[PDB]
Amino acid sequence: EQTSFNNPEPMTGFEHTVTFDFQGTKMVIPYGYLARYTQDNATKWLSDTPGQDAYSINLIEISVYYKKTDQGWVLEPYNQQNKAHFIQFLRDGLDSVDDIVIRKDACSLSTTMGERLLTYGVKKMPSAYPEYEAYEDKRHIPENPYFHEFYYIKKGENPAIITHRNNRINQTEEDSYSTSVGSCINGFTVQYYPFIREKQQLTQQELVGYHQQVEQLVQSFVNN
Ligand code: NA
């Protein structure tokens, strides 16, 4: 197989697509979601290669810019309005651009994760979305009064586990929350650390909202 970077810098991110193949299963991705697959300060972008039906891969790593709006947070491909955020990201990773890793594998999220959490002393709490079970870990650590973690677990056809935790361990430090998401969407595994520049505690609505956008996005790639 041969790689090509024949596409221009995007204006919207939707002007071209690239076709990928996971052992026969195709995914067609608007090229603005592929900022890591570029050359020369994001002036040459990955393109379908003549004579090759698809890029045969084991994983795809898309990159999305996340942005606050009046209607929530939204995810964007590279475009002329947000490009400076991607340029910073490509230099040192230090901007509001998240990576989402897509593979094609059988789901291995536990259908009994919540039961396990209960056995560990993590407690169930009310959920804003009935299809998610919510849990809060407030277990006591004498040396770490800041220990605090949340889980939001979805089952169904496309299960997901969202973990949101305070990374602060001392008193001079500030609160610094981070998030992990593991999920299975339409036969794919989709794993990511969203909101990478946010240190503030995020609500269930912010976290589930992001994941709903990711589910729609990944599904749009196999609608083609
Ligand atoms: Na690659």
Numbering used by the authors: 44 to 267
Task: Give the article text.
FrpD is a highly conserved lipoprotein located in the outer membrane of all meningococcal strains, and it does not exhibit similarity to known protein sequences from other organisms. Intriguingly, the FrpC1-414 fragment exhibits a very high affinity (KD ~ 0.2 nM) for FrpD, the other protein expressed from the iron-regulated frpDC operon. Hence, the similarity of FrpD fold topology to other proteins was not sufficient for establishment of structural homology, indicating that FrpD possesses a novel fold.
The protein crystallized in two alternative crystal forms, belonging to the hexagonal space group P64 and the orthorhombic space group P212121, both accommodating a single molecule in the asymmetric unit. Experimental phases were obtained from single-wavelength anomalous dispersion (SAD) of crystals of selenomethionine-labelled FrpD protein (SeMet FrpD) grown in the orthorhombic space group. The structure of the SeMet FrpD protein was refined to 1.4 Å resolution with an R value of 16.8% (Rfree of 19.3%). The structure is characterized by a C-terminal α-helix (α3) that traverses a series of antiparallel β-strands.
